[PDB]
Design the sequence.
C-alpha cells in the first residue's frame, strides 16, 4: 500500500509546428494510480485524433498530442490518484521555430506590388517564428520606421509596410523585410512600382 509517486517526472517539450509532442511520466503506487491529463486545469479526454493516451507495464503514461499548433503550446498538468493521495506534475510545451517570411505573391523571385500615385498601399507580409521575431524593413541603405513618411505594423504573425499618404513616384523601388529570432533568419525583397 503506497501513495502515487512520479518515479519519472514530466519534462518540458520543445517542438516544431505540425509534429507530434509526447509527454511521458512514470508512476508507481499501490493501488494503482489513476492517471488523468489536463491543460490549464481542464481534463484532456483522448479522442485518438488530437490527443492519444498510451499506458505501458511498470507505470508508464504518455499523452501524445498530434499535429502541434501553437494553441497546444501551453502548460500541461498530470495527476495520479489512489487511496493514498494525489500528486500532480507540471510541464510546458513550447514551440521553437526559426523565423521565416511567407510572401503570398512573387514575380521573378521577388515580391511585387504594383501601385498608382493615389493608392494607399499596404505590403502585408506574413511570417512564422517562435519567438516572435524582430522585424526590420529597409530601402537600400535606409532603415524604415513610423516617423513621418512610413509606418510599419508588426503583429504576432504579420508585418505590413504602409504609405499613410498616397504612394509617390519616389517610394518606388526595392524593399527588404527581415525577420530574426533565436533560431534563424529570413529575408525577402519586395519590388514596388508606380505607373
Sequence:
Amino acid at each position: 500500500a503506497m501513495a502515487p509517486h512520479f518515479k519519472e517526472e514530466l519534462r518540458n517539450l520543445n517542438v516544431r509546428y505540425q509534429s507530434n509532442a509526447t509527454l511521458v511520466c512514470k508512476v508507481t503506487g499501490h493501488p494503482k494510480p489513476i492517471v488523468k491529463w489536463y491543460r490549464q486545469g481542464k481534463e484532456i479526454i483522448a479522442d485518438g485524433l488530437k490527443y492519444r493516451i498510451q499506458e505501458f507495464k511498470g507505470g508508464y503514461h504518455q499523452l501524445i498530442i498530434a499535429s502541434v499548433t501553437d494553441d497546444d503550446a501551453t502548460v500541461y498538468q498530470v495527476r495520479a490518484t489512489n487511496q493514498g493521495g494525489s500528486v500532480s506534475g507540471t510541464a510546458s510545451l513550447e514551440v521553437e521555430v526559426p523565423a521565416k517570411i511567407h510572401l503570398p505573391k512573387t514575380l521573378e523571385g521577388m515580391g511585387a506590388v504594383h501601385a498608382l500615385r493615389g493608392e494607399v498601399v499596404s505590403i502585408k507580409i506574413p511570417f512564422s517564428g517562435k519567438p516572435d521575431p524582430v522585424i526590420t524593413w529597409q530601402k537600400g541603405q535606409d532603415l524604415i520606421d513610423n516617423n513621418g513618411h512610413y509606418q510599419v505594423i508588426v503583429t504576432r504573425s504579420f508585418t505590413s509596410l504602409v504609405f499613410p499618404n498616397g504612394v509617390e513616384r519616389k517610394d518606388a523601388g526595392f524593399y527588404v523585410v527581415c525577420a530574426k529570432n533565436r533560431f534563424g533568419i529570413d529575408q525577402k525583397t519586395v519590388e514596388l512600382d508606380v505607373a
Notes: Residues 99 and 185 are 5 Å apart (CA to CA). DSSP finds no helices and 18 strands in the chain. The domain at 1-98 is CATH 2.60.40.10 (Immunoglobulin-like). The chain has two domains: 1-98, 99-195.
